[PDB]
Paper text:
The catalytic domain enables the rapid hydrolysis of nucleoside 2′,3′-cyclic phosphates to nucleoside 2′-phosphates. The [name] catalytic site, lying in a groove between two lobes, has pseudo two-fold symmetry and contains two apposing His-X-Thr-X (X denotes a hydrophobic residue) motifs, characteristic for 2H phosphoesterases 113537.
In mouse [name], this is done by His230, Thr232, His309, and Thr311, in a manner, where a nucleophilic water molecule activated by His309 can attack the cyclic phosphate and a pentavalent transition state is formed. Overall, the structures of H230S, H309S, H230Q, [name], and H230Q/[name] are highly similar. However, only H230S and H309S could be used to trap nucleotide ligands within the active site, whereas [name] and the H230Q/[name] double mutant could not.
Numbering used by the authors: 162 to 209, 213 to 378
The structure:
Amino acid sequence: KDFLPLYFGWFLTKKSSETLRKAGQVFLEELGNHKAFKKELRHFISGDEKLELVSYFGKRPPGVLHCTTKFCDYGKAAGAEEYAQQEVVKRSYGKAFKLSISALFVTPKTAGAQVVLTDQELQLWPSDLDKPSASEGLPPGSRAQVTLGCAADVQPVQTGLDLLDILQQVKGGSQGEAVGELPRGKLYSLGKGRWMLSLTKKMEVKAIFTGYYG
Ligand SMILES: [Cl-]
């Protein structure tokens, strides 16, 4: 039998990947400089003057940025075969999509970009994730994200988990008043080391849906 990709997802074009990557780095530099962030350092880290977040997020994706749909590990991951055999997955393979980025976020584990999927794109979102959005009362695909960085001991799956936690809080209405205004939008302090920049203008990135084999 044919084995499957390591994972499926939307791979950003070089140009869109660079645009988003650079914006994410600028966000880390702006956030680390912000007085609201510096004030809350004890809830972010356990050791001490200034924390450079670019250094803190010391593992970054090495190639182009991507929005993962289904991790398959060549067939060895749960639900991989069922995902890959879907008509819509085969139909979409190699095809171009536009992804809407609505927010950048930081936690003590990850730095990411929130993706708001279209209905057509949601058809490619897996229905069997460990800790699916629906398990927390959120719409499927809510945790779609592009990972921009993570801390030394952190794994890729963490970014979507962190986003789900942030979105659950906003749902609770504990987003709070903005604590600052950055060039690209309002900054929110969600507690427990968690920060969100809500973009005034959503960032559209071009991507191709396909399979990565490593
Ligand atoms: Cl989900």
